[PDB]
RNA sequence: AUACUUACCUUAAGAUAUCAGAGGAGAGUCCUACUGAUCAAACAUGCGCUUCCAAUAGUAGAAGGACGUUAAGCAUUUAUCAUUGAACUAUAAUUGUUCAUUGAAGUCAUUGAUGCAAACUCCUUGGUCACACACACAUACGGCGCGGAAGGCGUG
RNA sequence: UUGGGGCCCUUUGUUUCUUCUGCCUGGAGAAGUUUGACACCAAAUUCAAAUUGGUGUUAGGGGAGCUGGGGCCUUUCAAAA
RNA sequence: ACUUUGCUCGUUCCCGUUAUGGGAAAAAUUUUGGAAGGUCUUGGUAGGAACGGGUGGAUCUUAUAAUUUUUGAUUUAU
RNA sequence: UCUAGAAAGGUAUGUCUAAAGU
């Protein structure tokens, strides 16, 4: 038999046609994505500090740092540090998620634009994007959204949009 | 008969395993796996110089014998001395048995004797 | 089997007159119907006549250049015709089951009460009550919405997209039974 | 380092083995799995080799110094046809007593997990 | 006899497996090594690494790995026109059988 | 039969960038589409290093399983569930 | 959560330490909360057993790295062939030599690669424990403090 | 209960067993400790709110009771000289 | 070896007597095994015992010495 | 000649039906 360690559900006689259909099951994909998000979150969130090996301080060090002065230490209440840690975690996540993307917005009318920046007509990763689009065997998945697709073809030329300013542009 | 069940009975005996490369391993034998995966405790790996002036040793086995890491460096010949090597089974060419063992009690196959007697 | 040379031995040994009951002539023509439905849920069991590859490639040679044996065609047509007429009976049973749902008693009395409730501005009131009765018939449809796949006889639906239909139409059942219908259409055109 | 005399490869999990292979290469990495075919899974292995040029320095006649090519490979699995010997190098990060504490704690957590899963699916 | 040779080996049962092994040793190609184990004649084995050995056979196996005794290894080596003949005497020895080429039986 | 932790780990890395060196010396590195039970892998959009160094590019490749020397999966599969020693499977069917 | 539709699939066999004795069940098998010995595992518990555990009476030190810098360091060594033209040493598929056409394929690197040696910087790891600032030793050295890590050996 | 001295506070989210309150002129107060409690990740319903699915945390030190084992001693009993 | 009769040496005690015998303990003591208790030192302290599995995982045996790992094309050699 | 009763599940999939306010 087979046992999906992430899923926690058994299965009957392990045939590759059953197993491969399980491994692209939507519910298995949700369980696996939760598992790996939580494990990466646990290894980020785990502050393991070095063990402390305290040596006995000497005399002249003790005179110098007993004759410097004493500094005040600041500390906060419980709700303050909880609110601050929520702020710090969302700021680290938006730095990890964002990316500068102005070279894509800035060449938006250029002549060979659809052959490089479209990301579906690229010659290196061109076939992969079309290949991994997914079946969408759900009618209501396509029936949810009612906007336009805006598929820019690879066959586009320099002639269309001859004057870029007159078609209404946006300032950066 | 399967003759690895003879090798399982030799425990804590010094052997001198010839490998397929040419390097020989000399140490206290231990639990031998059923596919002849020998585990040796206190080994003295060595690689014999060919004892002709013009000839070459094995190059692959020489680099392997250094990259065990425990090669005692200042010595002249390729001798590495380490503890606990775990030799994979399909690489042992021949095993030089100790001399003192009594073959006439070791080579009695218990399972063959049982299968001849019970049938 | 377990070691791959065992399975390879199995294949070469089944590779190594040509008449009588020993050889399934229906497989020999091609696509034995007890072979196309081995593992599925419409499984007939095992093909009674044995199947063998040396005989099959000898038949490939014979119908390549030598001759054709029409007794094989009439035997295959008999087995094909009895299976196709049996599954025509079964799709008749399936649409009978849709009818028997459609002429259910309490649903007919409910639609009869709503159709007595259907009884200028009289036409506007009648059309509003008849659109309510049309939505009652469509509520009975929203309980089911079943059409019948005309080849295999299994149920289908139209609210579902083309892609889950494409998931159905590349089946073992539906491809096997399409192959049966196509050899039946070919032999009934050719014999007539 | 000293390894126990009766310690097969099933017992040396999370040690830092030094797996020799058929080519003179050596994969110094932390072991974490193995198999019937003896094809390990090394965690942080560093595939070394002695080059064709410096191999004359190992030829039999201060000390000798060899410059090897450390090439970092993260979480390899090996193919067991290639392996030639395994030698232990370093002990684990944890002790034995600490691994005992952590193993009892993991088994306790698994039994609580299955208890909650069973009593949730009965509800 | 015929019933165990003709069938594939996965259709035999356990008593027929052991009977087949006894048949393969007693009436077969390894009957050479078995006759030399009983009759105490020295064998000459040509290993795959161009070492020839000469010994007596205490036991053998289905893989042709064998426990020898009074082993006399004989190999030749050369680098160019310089060439010597070498000899090594080993008392008791286990030969892993995947290296053998031709077991011979001395007249 | 049973596969054990390495071949099952290789099946856990279907979809991600792996880097494998054959026994002839070559090094292929791409997205791993379908591995199999005998470590027989496919690789899509690969960057193929020949043994003397000449790197080329090729769309898909199917190595024989027997020629692989190692396979370098991503780092996060250290935390894969099959490495958990004390596991509590619920119930057989 | 419930329900229906459709797809895919339905399990290699045997065993759980050995030897030996005693007893029994219609020559062999099977069994004994039967009996001895051997092996193995766990748990305890021990050895004058072996190895290792970082200055403050000071600004140090050990083991391991650097996929760190000086650094284009110092010394060497490489950078495609053909068909022809003009000349050309020349057994070759005009090879050698300068210039060009045409033709095969053609990882990048030449601040590279290979060899050699040093200096500086930065990481990770631990008992930074307790007592003491002392005159020991041929059977060479009270190994006669509390622990911790790893191995050896013995018993229950 | 108070006062003084030494050492540590990197315990960096100022004791890290959790929640709430709280602090460097201080080292504190309450509540809780496994058919549970708590922290967090994901998603769709168009803020939060809610449910469903996952990953974790639930600690360290000392003391009375009962108990497994070892060493020494005393008393008794059976056996060997 | 049992058995009896007297002599001699002798562990301890008594008696005829401190020559030496008679009687008793067949002893004082040492070792091994068991119970009780003293004290020291180390560990555990919420789950454990019996039974049932068309129960999971390990290990072994056999298919398995025939192209995918373990019964050889990596000592570069003619 | 020695008495034939085939499983009953698992995962994947869409659709229906439904449960929510401020
Ligand atoms: Zn799953
Ligand atoms: Zn047929
Ligand atoms: Zn259909």
mmCIF file of C-alpha atoms (C1' of nucleotides) in Angstrom, chain B residues 2 21 34-37 58 88-90 93, chain I residues 60-62 65 69-72 74-76:
data_model
loop_
_atom_site.group_PDB
_atom_site.id
_atom_site.type_symbol
_atom_site.label_atom_id
_atom_site.label_comp_id
_atom_site.label_asym_id
_atom_site.label_seq_id
_atom_site.Cartn_x
_atom_site.Cartn_y
_atom_site.Cartn_z
ATOM 1 C CA UNK B 2 25.461 -20.339 1.410
ATOM 2 C CA UNK B 21 41.388 -2.178 -5.977
ATOM 3 C CA UNK B 34 24.215 -11.165 4.703
ATOM 4 C CA UNK B 35 25.507 -9.496 1.524
ATOM 5 C CA UNK B 36 29.061 -9.792 2.927
ATOM 6 C CA UNK B 37 29.284 -6.155 4.156
ATOM 7 C CA UNK B 58 46.817 2.130 -8.321
ATOM 8 C CA UNK B 88 30.853 -2.592 1.237
ATOM 9 C CA UNK B 89 30.300 -6.209 0.252
ATOM 10 C CA UNK B 90 30.925 -6.300 -3.480
ATOM 11 C CA UNK B 93 38.260 -9.950 -3.493
ATOM 12 C "C1'" C I 60 15.952 -12.888 8.775
ATOM 13 C "C1'" U I 61 14.983 -16.877 4.946
ATOM 14 C "C1'" U I 62 13.449 -17.837 -0.379
ATOM 15 C "C1'" A I 65 24.688 -15.411 -9.287
ATOM 16 C "C1'" U I 69 22.588 -1.144 -6.878
ATOM 17 C "C1'" U I 70 25.362 -6.928 -3.414
ATOM 18 C "C1'" U I 71 28.703 -12.525 -6.888
ATOM 19 C "C1'" G I 72 32.598 -7.395 -10.968
ATOM 20 C "C1'" U I 74 37.885 1.703 -13.055
ATOM 21 C "C1'" U I 75 45.215 -1.533 -10.562
ATOM 22 C "C1'" U I 76 44.941 1.040 -18.302
#
